[PDB]
Amino acid sequence: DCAWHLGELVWCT
Amino acid sequence: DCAWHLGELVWCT
Amino acid sequence: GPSVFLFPPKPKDTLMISRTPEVTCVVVDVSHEDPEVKFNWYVDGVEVHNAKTKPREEQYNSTYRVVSVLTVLHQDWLNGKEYKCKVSNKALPAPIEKTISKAKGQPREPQVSTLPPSREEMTKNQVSLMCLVYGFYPSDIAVEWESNGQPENNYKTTPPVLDSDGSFFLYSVLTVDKSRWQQGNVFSCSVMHEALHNHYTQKSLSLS
Amino acid sequence: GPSVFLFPPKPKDTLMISRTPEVTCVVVDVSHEDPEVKFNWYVDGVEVHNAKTKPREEQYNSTYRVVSVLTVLHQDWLNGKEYKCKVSNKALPAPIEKTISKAKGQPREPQVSTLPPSREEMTKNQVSLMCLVYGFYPSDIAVEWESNGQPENNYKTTPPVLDSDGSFFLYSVLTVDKSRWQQGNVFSCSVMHEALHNHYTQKSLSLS
């Protein structure tokens, strides 16, 4: 469960 | 005794 | 229900007598069913009547935003007067009040340290000039750049950072074509802050 | 004598695991006569040795600036660890120490209210889209704009403003050509903050 910003990794849970 | 910024009045003493 | 946000004036506006500072009371999520908003404004608890009423504007999902702007006197703001926006609406159990004023505490004058392009910088086609502005209080400050009496807009400025003595610092970096620097043009960072004489100072950089 | 300023990392860098946050210890007004600067770095009082040493650079009037950058671990910063820069130089009676860490207090998640173009806005050739971001703590936050998976850079964001409950709010405004809006393109404001799930949320606006 990961968030992405413009193709770049933000954070994972 | 006044200060000016790019032709505009700032402050006077 | 509706939410209320009270924005302070821009530092540049409160510091330049030729500009018009204002506080802005923003109400969002006003329902379509109960859309009337009444604004009352107070300066140190004394009701004032000169605020502009703006027409409501559409948000999504059957709501409006409604905004009221109060022009403030530079000296009133700088003297620490409290501005209160009171917001009344049928969907609210009670009116919402917000108060804002300038930060309290002894004002302190900003100092500036300039930095000309690094050795590596001078190998590229653009160079960076920096002004480190420090030791100021309150954190409200305006920093801009210019050359030969014209504005230079290709700069970036950090937020103010709290230092260990309770004053603030930041840096601002202007990026210019190296040819303009090599020609010998003088570039200046202008600083406006309430603790400066006439709210104003300027430091300059040129090819030395 | 020399002055020391310790800059915190950029919020975006501390919040995105793919970026590298760093704290920056800046020393200005280092004399030509006593130019050596020794940096010691500590994390919660424990000395660390991984800082980069940058070559001194020339300032005006026979001085240097000298900078040291320490990469920080995202989780360390977010957990409230204290980073200390100790600066030693012959012209200083004693070493100067600066400490920085994330603001203390219960983190609170940002909320977003969007605002599509006003009625008057739609008569012009450019339109403004707004995201009001509120109720967040600490004030460290990153807000950017995009459409169709590409960045949209023609925006301006206010500084965070302290609200009456101790949380913060701001607004960000993106300005775009009206034709792009009329075509039906979706524009989004992305918000990064530590109290969000995976540090991230996005709200969207399009012609309705």
Short mmCIF file of C-alpha atoms in Angstrom, two decimals:
data_model
loop_
_atom_site.label_atom_id
_atom_site.label_comp_id
_atom_site.label_asym_id
_atom_site.label_seq_id
_atom_site.Cartn_x
_atom_site.Cartn_y
_atom_site.Cartn_z
CA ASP A 1 0.00 0.00 0.00
CA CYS A 2 2.15 2.80 -1.40
CA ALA A 3 1.51 6.39 -2.47
CA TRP A 4 3.17 7.78 -5.60
CA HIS A 5 3.67 11.39 -6.68
CA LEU A 6 4.28 12.01 -10.38
CA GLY A 7 5.91 8.55 -10.73
CA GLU A 8 8.06 8.91 -7.60
CA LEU A 9 7.60 6.92 -4.43
CA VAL A 10 6.21 8.83 -1.44
CA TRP A 11 5.63 6.32 1.38
CA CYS A 12 4.47 2.78 2.06
CA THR A 13 2.38 1.11 4.74
CA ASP B 1 13.67 61.19 4.74
CA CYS B 2 11.82 58.59 2.68
CA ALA B 3 12.66 55.14 1.33
CA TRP B 4 11.58 54.14 -2.17
CA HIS B 5 11.31 50.69 -3.74
CA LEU B 6 11.35 50.50 -7.53
CA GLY B 7 9.77 53.99 -7.76
CA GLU B 8 7.12 53.29 -5.10
CA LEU B 9 7.01 54.91 -1.69
CA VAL B 10 7.88 52.65 1.26
CA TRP B 11 7.95 54.81 4.40
CA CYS B 12 8.94 58.24 5.67
CA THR B 13 10.52 59.57 8.85
CA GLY C 1 -21.27 23.26 8.63
CA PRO C 2 -19.29 26.28 7.33
CA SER C 3 -15.62 26.88 8.25
CA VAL C 4 -13.94 30.26 8.77
CA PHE C 5 -10.34 31.26 8.06
CA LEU C 6 -8.87 34.67 8.86
CA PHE C 7 -5.79 35.58 6.78
CA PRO C 8 -3.32 38.29 7.89
CA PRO C 9 -2.09 40.98 5.50
CA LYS C 10 0.96 40.50 3.28
CA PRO C 11 4.13 41.85 4.99
CA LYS C 12 5.01 43.99 1.93
CA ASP C 13 1.56 45.64 2.09
CA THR C 14 1.83 46.50 5.82
CA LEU C 15 5.35 47.91 5.34
CA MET C 16 4.86 50.06 2.22
CA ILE C 17 2.72 53.14 2.86
CA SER C 18 1.77 53.27 -0.84
CA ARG C 19 0.18 49.78 -0.67
CA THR C 20 -3.08 48.77 1.00
CA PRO C 21 -2.91 45.95 3.55
CA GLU C 22 -6.03 43.94 4.30
CA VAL C 23 -7.24 41.07 6.44
CA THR C 24 -9.41 38.49 4.68
CA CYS C 25 -12.17 36.48 6.37
CA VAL C 26 -12.90 33.40 4.25
CA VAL C 27 -15.98 31.25 4.83
CA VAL C 28 -16.17 27.89 3.03
CA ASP C 29 -18.78 25.10 2.94
CA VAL C 30 -21.73 27.49 3.19
CA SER C 31 -24.84 25.40 2.39
CA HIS C 32 -27.16 26.14 -0.56
CA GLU C 33 -30.08 25.88 1.86
CA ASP C 34 -28.75 28.44 4.39
CA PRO C 35 -26.44 30.61 2.29
CA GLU C 36 -26.66 34.03 3.96
CA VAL C 37 -23.52 35.05 5.76
CA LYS C 38 -23.37 38.12 8.02
CA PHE C 39 -19.92 39.58 8.79
CA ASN C 40 -19.16 41.79 11.78
CA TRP C 41 -15.68 43.32 12.03
CA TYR C 42 -13.94 44.68 15.11
CA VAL C 43 -10.66 46.53 15.73
CA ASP C 44 -9.62 46.12 19.38
CA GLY C 45 -13.26 45.24 20.14
CA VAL C 46 -14.64 48.36 18.42
CA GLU C 47 -16.98 47.59 15.50
CA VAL C 48 -15.96 48.99 12.11
CA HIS C 49 -18.21 49.27 9.05
CA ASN C 50 -15.93 49.76 6.05
CA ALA C 51 -15.55 46.11 4.90
CA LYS C 52 -16.37 45.16 1.32
CA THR C 53 -19.05 42.48 0.82
CA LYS C 54 -18.13 40.11 -2.04
CA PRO C 55 -20.73 38.11 -3.95
CA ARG C 56 -20.93 34.44 -2.94
CA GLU C 57 -19.19 32.02 -5.29
CA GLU C 58 -19.95 28.41 -6.16
CA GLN C 59 -18.03 25.55 -4.67
CA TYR C 60 -18.75 21.89 -5.49
CA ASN C 61 -21.53 19.78 -3.97
CA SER C 62 -24.16 22.52 -3.41
CA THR C 63 -22.09 24.93 -1.32
CA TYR C 64 -20.72 28.45 -1.61
CA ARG C 65 -17.69 30.27 -0.45
CA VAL C 66 -18.22 33.78 0.91
CA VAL C 67 -15.39 36.24 1.55
CA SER C 68 -15.07 39.60 3.33
CA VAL C 69 -12.01 41.85 3.10
CA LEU C 70 -11.18 44.58 5.62
CA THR C 71 -8.56 47.21 4.71
CA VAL C 72 -6.28 47.88 7.66
CA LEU C 73 -4.20 50.94 8.58
CA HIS C 74 -0.46 50.23 8.43
CA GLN C 75 0.25 51.86 11.77
CA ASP C 76 -2.69 50.08 13.46
CA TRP C 77 -1.38 46.71 12.36
CA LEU C 78 2.18 47.53 13.35
CA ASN C 79 1.02 48.84 16.75
CA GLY C 80 -0.51 45.42 17.51
CA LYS C 81 -4.23 46.10 17.12
CA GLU C 82 -6.49 43.03 17.09
CA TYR C 83 -8.78 42.44 14.12
CA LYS C 84 -11.82 40.25 14.70
CA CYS C 85 -14.10 38.73 12.09
CA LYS C 86 -17.47 37.49 13.39
CA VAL C 87 -19.37 35.15 11.03
CA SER C 88 -23.12 34.53 11.40
CA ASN C 89 -25.05 31.88 9.49
CA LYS C 90 -28.28 29.95 10.17
CA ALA C 91 -26.55 26.54 10.02
CA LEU C 92 -24.17 27.59 12.81
CA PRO C 93 -25.23 26.91 16.44
CA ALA C 94 -23.37 30.13 17.40
CA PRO C 95 -21.46 32.77 15.41
CA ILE C 96 -17.80 31.89 14.72
CA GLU C 97 -15.23 34.51 15.79
CA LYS C 98 -11.63 34.69 14.61
CA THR C 99 -9.03 37.20 15.85
CA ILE C 100 -5.64 38.01 14.34
CA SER C 101 -2.83 40.46 15.14
CA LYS C 102 0.90 40.96 14.64
CA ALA C 103 3.23 38.73 16.70
CA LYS C 104 4.14 40.24 20.08
CA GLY C 105 7.70 40.82 21.31
CA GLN C 106 10.59 43.23 20.79
CA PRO C 107 11.14 43.87 17.06
CA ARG C 108 14.70 43.17 15.90
CA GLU C 109 16.39 44.47 12.78
CA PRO C 110 17.43 42.06 9.99
CA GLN C 111 21.12 41.74 9.08
CA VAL C 112 22.25 40.62 5.62
CA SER C 113 25.19 38.51 4.46
CA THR C 114 25.74 38.36 0.70
CA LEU C 115 27.32 35.54 -1.28
CA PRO C 116 28.68 35.95 -4.83
CA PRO C 117 28.81 32.94 -7.27
CA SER C 118 30.93 29.92 -6.22
CA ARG C 119 34.00 28.83 -8.22
CA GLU C 120 32.00 25.98 -9.82
CA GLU C 121 29.10 28.40 -10.51
CA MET C 122 31.29 30.54 -12.78
CA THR C 123 31.82 27.56 -15.15
CA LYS C 124 28.07 27.36 -15.98
CA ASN C 125 25.84 29.61 -18.12
CA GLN C 126 23.75 30.76 -15.13
CA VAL C 127 25.03 32.00 -11.79
CA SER C 128 23.37 32.24 -8.36
CA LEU C 129 23.56 35.20 -5.98
CA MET C 130 22.51 34.83 -2.36
CA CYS C 131 21.42 37.00 0.50
CA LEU C 132 21.24 35.42 3.91
CA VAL C 133 18.91 37.55 6.01
CA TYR C 134 19.07 36.99 9.75
CA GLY C 135 18.44 38.15 13.31
CA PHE C 136 14.99 39.57 12.59
CA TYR C 137 11.75 39.61 14.60
CA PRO C 138 8.83 39.27 13.94
CA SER C 139 9.16 36.71 11.11
CA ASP C 140 7.07 38.97 8.78
CA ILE C 141 9.49 40.10 6.08
CA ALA C 142 9.59 40.78 2.33
CA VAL C 143 12.65 40.06 0.18
CA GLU C 144 12.90 40.93 -3.53
CA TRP C 145 15.65 41.43 -6.12
CA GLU C 146 16.47 44.11 -8.64
CA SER C 147 19.12 45.52 -10.94
CA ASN C 148 19.44 48.96 -12.52
CA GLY C 149 16.06 50.01 -11.08
CA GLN C 150 14.14 47.06 -12.61
CA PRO C 151 12.75 44.01 -10.79
CA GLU C 152 14.61 40.69 -11.05
CA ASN C 153 12.10 37.87 -10.57
CA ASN C 154 14.10 34.66 -11.04
CA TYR C 155 14.67 34.06 -7.30
CA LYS C 156 13.59 31.63 -4.57
CA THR C 157 13.42 32.38 -0.84
CA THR C 158 13.24 29.90 2.06
CA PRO C 159 10.62 30.29 4.79
CA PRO C 160 11.85 32.08 7.94
CA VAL C 161 13.63 29.71 10.31
CA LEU C 162 13.63 30.11 14.07
CA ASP C 163 17.13 30.61 15.52
CA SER C 164 18.22 29.76 19.06
CA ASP C 165 17.85 33.36 20.35
CA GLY C 166 14.20 33.57 19.15
CA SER C 167 15.00 35.66 16.05
CA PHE C 168 14.55 34.39 12.49
CA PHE C 169 16.69 33.87 9.42
CA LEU C 170 16.24 32.84 5.78
CA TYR C 171 18.03 32.87 2.48
CA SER C 172 17.06 34.13 -0.94
CA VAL C 173 18.78 33.08 -4.20
CA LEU C 174 18.58 34.95 -7.50
CA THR C 175 19.65 33.09 -10.65
CA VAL C 176 20.88 35.14 -13.62
CA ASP C 177 22.57 34.59 -17.02
CA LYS C 178 26.33 34.65 -16.43
CA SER C 179 26.88 37.23 -19.23
CA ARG C 180 24.81 39.81 -17.29
CA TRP C 181 27.08 39.24 -14.28
CA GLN C 182 30.26 39.31 -16.38
CA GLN C 183 29.19 42.61 -17.96
CA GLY C 184 29.51 44.17 -14.45
CA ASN C 185 25.81 44.75 -13.66
CA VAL C 186 24.99 45.32 -9.99
CA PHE C 187 22.27 43.10 -8.47
CA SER C 188 20.62 43.91 -5.17
CA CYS C 189 18.43 42.13 -2.65
CA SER C 190 15.94 44.51 -1.09
CA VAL C 191 14.66 43.68 2.40
CA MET C 192 11.54 45.15 4.01
CA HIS C 193 10.93 44.67 7.71
CA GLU C 194 9.34 46.78 10.41
CA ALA C 195 12.51 47.09 12.51
CA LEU C 196 14.50 48.67 9.66
CA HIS C 197 14.74 52.44 9.29
CA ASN C 198 11.87 53.38 6.96
CA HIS C 199 11.18 49.61 6.71
CA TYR C 200 13.83 49.20 4.10
CA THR C 201 17.37 48.15 3.29
CA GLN C 202 19.28 46.89 0.24
CA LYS C 203 22.53 44.98 -0.24
CA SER C 204 24.37 44.73 -3.52
CA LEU C 205 26.54 42.21 -5.41
CA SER C 206 28.67 42.66 -8.54
CA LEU C 207 31.69 41.02 -10.22
CA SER C 208 34.70 41.91 -8.02
CA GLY D 1 33.38 36.89 14.15
CA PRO D 2 31.68 34.06 12.19
CA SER D 3 27.91 33.38 12.40
CA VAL D 4 26.20 29.98 12.23
CA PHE D 5 22.79 29.11 10.80
CA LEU D 6 21.24 25.64 10.94
CA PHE D 7 18.57 25.01 8.27
CA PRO D 8 15.97 22.21 8.62
CA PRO D 9 15.19 19.83 5.77
CA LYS D 10 12.57 20.60 3.13
CA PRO D 11 9.16 19.09 4.11
CA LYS D 12 8.84 17.33 0.71
CA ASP D 13 12.23 15.63 1.27
CA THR D 14 11.33 14.35 4.77
CA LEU D 15 7.96 13.04 3.53
CA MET D 16 9.00 11.26 0.32
CA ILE D 17 11.03 8.10 0.96
CA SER D 18 12.60 8.39 -2.51
CA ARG D 19 14.10 11.82 -1.67
CA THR D 20 17.02 12.60 0.63
CA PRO D 21 16.39 15.11 3.42
CA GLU D 22 19.31 16.99 4.92
CA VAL D 23 20.11 19.58 7.56
CA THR D 24 22.52 22.33 6.50
CA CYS D 25 24.93 24.10 8.86
CA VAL D 26 25.98 27.40 7.27
CA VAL D 27 28.89 29.43 8.60
CA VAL D 28 29.36 32.98 7.26
CA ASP D 29 31.92 35.73 7.94
CA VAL D 30 34.81 33.30 8.41
CA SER D 31 37.99 35.44 8.41
CA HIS D 32 40.78 35.02 5.83
CA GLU D 33 43.24 34.97 8.73
CA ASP D 34 41.53 32.15 10.68
CA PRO D 35 39.63 30.26 7.98
CA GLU D 36 39.59 26.67 9.26
CA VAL D 37 36.20 25.48 10.37
CA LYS D 38 35.70 22.17 12.21
CA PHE D 39 32.19 20.67 12.20
CA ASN D 40 30.94 18.13 14.74
CA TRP D 41 27.49 16.63 14.21
CA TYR D 42 25.26 14.93 16.77
CA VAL D 43 21.95 13.06 16.60
CA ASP D 44 20.29 13.05 20.05
CA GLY D 45 23.74 13.81 21.52
CA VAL D 46 25.43 10.89 19.71
CA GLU D 47 28.22 11.97 17.34
CA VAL D 48 27.80 10.98 13.69
CA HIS D 49 30.55 11.03 11.05
CA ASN D 50 28.82 10.91 7.67
CA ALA D 51 28.61 14.67 6.89
CA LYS D 52 30.02 16.02 3.64
CA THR D 53 32.72 18.71 3.92
CA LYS D 54 32.28 21.40 1.23
CA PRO D 55 35.15 23.58 0.04
CA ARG D 56 35.13 27.11 1.49
CA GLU D 57 33.80 29.80 -0.84
CA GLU D 58 34.67 33.49 -1.14
CA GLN D 59 32.48 36.17 0.32
CA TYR D 60 33.30 39.90 0.05
CA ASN D 61 35.76 41.78 2.26
CA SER D 62 38.28 38.97 2.94
CA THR D 63 35.90 36.36 4.36
CA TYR D 64 34.64 32.91 3.44
CA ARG D 65 31.48 31.00 3.84
CA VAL D 66 31.80 27.35 4.86
CA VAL D 67 28.93 24.86 4.72
CA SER D 68 28.34 21.32 6.02
CA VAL D 69 25.39 19.14 5.02
CA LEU D 70 24.16 16.15 7.02
CA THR D 71 21.77 13.67 5.38
CA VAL D 72 19.02 12.68 7.81
CA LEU D 73 16.85 9.56 8.00
CA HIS D 74 13.18 10.32 7.29
CA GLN D 75 11.92 8.33 10.25
CA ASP D 76 14.51 9.87 12.61
CA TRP D 77 13.37 13.36 11.70
CA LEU D 78 9.71 12.46 11.96
CA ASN D 79 10.29 10.77 15.34
CA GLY D 80 11.62 14.06 16.73
CA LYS D 81 15.36 13.39 16.92
CA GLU D 82 17.56 16.42 17.62
CA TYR D 83 20.32 17.32 15.18
CA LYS D 84 23.20 19.40 16.52
CA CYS D 85 25.88 21.19 14.52
CA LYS D 86 28.96 22.24 16.52
CA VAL D 87 31.22 24.82 14.80
CA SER D 88 34.84 25.35 15.88
CA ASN D 89 37.05 28.19 14.64
CA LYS D 90 40.09 29.99 16.08
CA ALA D 91 38.37 33.41 16.04
CA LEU D 92 35.56 32.08 18.24
CA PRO D 93 35.98 32.32 22.05
CA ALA D 94 34.02 29.03 22.30
CA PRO D 95 32.50 26.65 19.72
CA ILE D 96 29.00 27.64 18.53
CA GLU D 97 26.31 24.95 18.83
CA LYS D 98 22.97 24.94 17.04
CA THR D 99 20.22 22.33 17.52
CA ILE D 100 17.15 21.73 15.37
CA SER D 101 14.27 19.23 15.38
CA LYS D 102 10.68 18.83 14.20
CA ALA D 103 8.01 20.84 16.07
CA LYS D 104 6.55 18.95 19.05
CA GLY D 105 2.84 18.28 19.58
CA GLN D 106 0.11 15.96 18.30
CA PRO D 107 0.21 15.76 14.48
CA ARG D 108 -3.11 16.63 12.82
CA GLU D 109 -4.22 15.71 9.33
CA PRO D 110 -4.79 18.43 6.69
CA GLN D 111 -8.28 18.89 5.20
CA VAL D 112 -8.81 20.42 1.76
CA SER D 113 -11.53 22.67 0.36
CA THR D 114 -11.43 23.26 -3.40
CA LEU D 115 -12.67 26.31 -5.28
CA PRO D 116 -13.40 26.33 -9.04
CA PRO D 117 -13.14 29.60 -11.09
CA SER D 118 -15.44 32.50 -10.08
CA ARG D 119 -18.14 33.84 -12.44
CA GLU D 120 -15.91 36.83 -13.34
CA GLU D 121 -12.91 34.48 -13.79
CA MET D 122 -14.67 32.63 -16.64
CA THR D 123 -14.82 35.88 -18.70
CA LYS D 124 -10.98 36.13 -18.85
CA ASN D 125 -8.39 34.12 -20.82
CA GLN D 126 -6.84 32.61 -17.67
CA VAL D 127 -8.65 31.02 -14.76
CA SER D 128 -7.60 30.36 -11.15
CA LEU D 129 -8.17 27.15 -9.19
CA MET D 130 -7.75 27.09 -5.43
CA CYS D 131 -7.15 24.59 -2.69
CA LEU D 132 -7.57 25.77 0.86
CA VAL D 133 -5.62 23.39 3.06
CA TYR D 134 -6.42 23.52 6.76
CA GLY D 135 -6.40 21.95 10.21
CA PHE D 136 -2.86 20.58 9.94
CA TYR D 137 -0.02 20.29 12.46
CA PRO D 138 2.97 20.67 12.35
CA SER D 139 3.11 23.54 9.82
CA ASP D 140 5.59 21.55 7.63
CA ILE D 141 3.68 20.76 4.45
CA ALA D 142 4.23 20.51 0.69
CA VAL D 143 1.57 21.50 -1.86
CA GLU D 144 1.97 21.07 -5.63
CA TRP D 145 -0.29 20.89 -8.70
CA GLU D 146 -0.64 18.54 -11.61
CA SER D 147 -2.84 17.43 -14.47
CA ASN D 148 -2.85 14.19 -16.47
CA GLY D 149 0.24 12.95 -14.60
CA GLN D 150 2.37 16.03 -15.43
CA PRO D 151 3.39 18.85 -13.06
CA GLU D 152 1.57 22.19 -13.25
CA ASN D 153 3.93 24.91 -12.03
CA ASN D 154 2.02 28.17 -12.47
CA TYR D 155 0.80 28.35 -8.83
CA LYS D 156 1.38 30.44 -5.70
CA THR D 157 0.92 29.26 -2.10
CA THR D 158 0.57 31.39 1.05
CA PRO D 159 2.69 30.66 4.13
CA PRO D 160 0.96 28.53 6.79
CA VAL D 161 -1.22 30.63 9.08
CA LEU D 162 -1.87 29.80 12.72
CA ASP D 163 -5.55 29.17 13.47
CA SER D 164 -7.25 29.62 16.85
CA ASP D 165 -7.06 25.89 17.76
CA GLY D 166 -3.27 25.79 17.19
CA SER D 167 -3.50 24.07 13.78
CA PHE D 168 -2.46 25.74 10.52
CA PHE D 169 -4.05 26.64 7.20
CA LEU D 170 -2.99 28.07 3.84
CA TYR D 171 -4.19 28.44 0.30
CA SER D 172 -2.64 27.57 -3.03
CA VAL D 173 -3.79 29.00 -6.39
CA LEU D 174 -3.01 27.53 -9.80
CA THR D 175 -3.54 29.74 -12.85
CA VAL D 176 -4.22 28.06 -16.20
CA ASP D 177 -5.30 29.01 -19.76
CA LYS D 178 -9.11 28.92 -19.83
CA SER D 179 -9.15 26.69 -22.96
CA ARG D 180 -7.42 23.89 -21.01
CA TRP D 181 -10.18 24.12 -18.38
CA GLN D 182 -12.95 24.33 -20.99
CA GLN D 183 -11.59 21.22 -22.73
CA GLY D 184 -12.49 19.27 -19.53
CA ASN D 185 -8.98 18.57 -18.19
CA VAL D 186 -8.79 17.58 -14.53
CA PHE D 187 -6.39 19.58 -12.32
CA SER D 188 -5.32 18.38 -8.90
CA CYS D 189 -3.62 19.83 -5.86
CA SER D 190 -1.40 17.27 -4.18
CA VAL D 191 -0.75 17.67 -0.45
CA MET D 192 2.06 15.99 1.50
CA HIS D 193 2.03 16.04 5.27
CA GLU D 194 3.16 13.62 7.95
CA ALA D 195 -0.32 13.10 9.42
CA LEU D 196 -1.79 11.88 6.11
CA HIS D 197 -1.92 8.18 5.27
CA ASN D 198 1.31 7.49 3.37
CA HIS D 199 2.00 11.26 3.68
CA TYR D 200 -0.17 11.99 0.72
CA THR D 201 -3.52 13.16 -0.55
CA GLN D 202 -4.90 14.78 -3.72
CA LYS D 203 -8.04 16.76 -4.53
CA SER D 204 -9.29 17.41 -8.02
CA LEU D 205 -11.13 20.14 -9.95
CA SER D 206 -12.69 20.08 -13.43
CA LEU D 207 -15.40 21.94 -15.41
CA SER D 208 -18.73 20.83 -13.87
#
